[PDB]
Amino acid sequence: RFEGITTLPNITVTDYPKQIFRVKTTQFTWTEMLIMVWVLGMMWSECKELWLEGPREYILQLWNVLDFGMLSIFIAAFTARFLAFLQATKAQQYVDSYVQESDLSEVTLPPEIQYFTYARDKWLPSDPQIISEGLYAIAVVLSFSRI
Amino acid sequence: AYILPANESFGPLQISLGRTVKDIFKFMVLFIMVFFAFMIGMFILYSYYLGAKVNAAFTTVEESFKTLFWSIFGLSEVTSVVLKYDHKFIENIGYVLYG
Ligand SMILES: CC(C)CCC[C@@H](C)[C@H]1CC[C@H]2[C@@H]3CC=C4C[C@@H](OC(=O)CCC(=O)O)CC[C@]4(C)[C@H]3CC[C@]12C
Numbered sequence: 410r411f412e413g414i415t416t417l418p419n420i421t422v423t424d425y426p427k428q429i430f431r432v433k434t435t436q437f438t439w440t441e442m443l444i445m446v447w448v449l450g451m452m453w454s455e456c457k458e459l460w461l462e463g464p465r466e467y468i469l470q471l472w473n474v475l476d477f478g479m480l481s482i483f484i485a486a487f488t489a490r491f492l493a494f495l496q497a498t499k500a501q502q503y504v505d506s507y508v509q510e511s512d513l514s515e516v517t518l519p520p521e522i523q524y525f526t527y528a529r530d531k532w533l534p535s536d537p538q539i540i541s542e543g544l545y546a547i548a549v550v551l552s553f554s555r556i
Numbered sequence: 557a558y559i560l561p562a563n564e565s566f567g568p569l570q571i572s573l574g575r576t577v578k579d580i581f582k583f584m585v586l587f588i589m590v591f592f593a594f595m596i597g598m599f600i601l602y603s604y605y606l607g608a609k610v611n612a613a614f615t616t617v618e619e620s621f622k623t624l625f626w627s628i629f630g631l632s633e634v635t636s637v638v639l640k641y642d643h644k645f646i647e648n649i650g651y652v653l654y655g
Pocket residue numbers: 559560561562563564
């Protein structure tokens with residue numbers, strides 16, 4: 410995406426027709442899982458030092474508070490992404506299980522389930538993936554401060 | 557610069573110029589670090605709204621660099637952050653990060 414996204418936010422592109430677009434959008438790539446286990450390790454180290462020094466002395470240093478907040482925000486972004494992906498894979502399971510057709514676009518689906526076929530523009534303002542993107546941007550901006 | 561030091565009026569000026577440049581190079585390095593931080597952050601934030609913004613400010617890497625750099629001299633408008641859609645959370649985070 411360094412030179413810009415290829416498809417417009419209005420268009421939905423999927424690898425195979427039976428799959429739900431949100432499964433394609435919210436799936437974890439390999440580098441993202443590397444970042445995830447990385448954040449888990451950093452959080453383990455920080456919680457170990459918290460348990461050792463104790464919360465009272467741990468909170469005194471403001472930079473340690475900043476680091477704790479950054480790690481928790483990364484965790485929150487990935488949790489919202491995973492909730493979006495759980496709804497995605499559940500709608501995908503419904504579509505693959507109950508309806509039969511060649512292409513999904515021609516089919517009419519139950520509305521609560523059909524919502525997961527919409528493109529970027531139609532998305533509800535409180536979608537968990539939107540929260541994920543925002544918190545992830547904030548977390549990157551804050552993580553660059555560890556220099 | 558090869559000619560000015562001969563002038564008693566302009567010599568000391570140019571000497572102080574060399575001095576302050578040598579000094580502020582370090583703060584320029586630190587500002588490069590923080591600027592790259594914010595650039596990558598806002599780029600990752602806004603990259604998906606290529607055709608859903610007022611202008612194309614934070615859509616790509618180079619254009620995000622241009623916008624954020626020109627923001628140093630106040631030559632960048634604040635409408636670059638606004639979105640066309642109703643994703644209020646993303647544009648609020650954009651306001652916060654830019655400020
Ligand atoms: C006004 C426009 C049309 C011309 C502007 C030219 C300046 C940008 C440059 C070109 C020639 C330069 C001058 C050429 C010779 C000298 C003499 C030099 O030495 C002295 O001050 C006299 C005592 C000594 O030489 O030891 C000091 C720099 C100065 C004024 C230079 C200063 C910078 C100058 C004026």
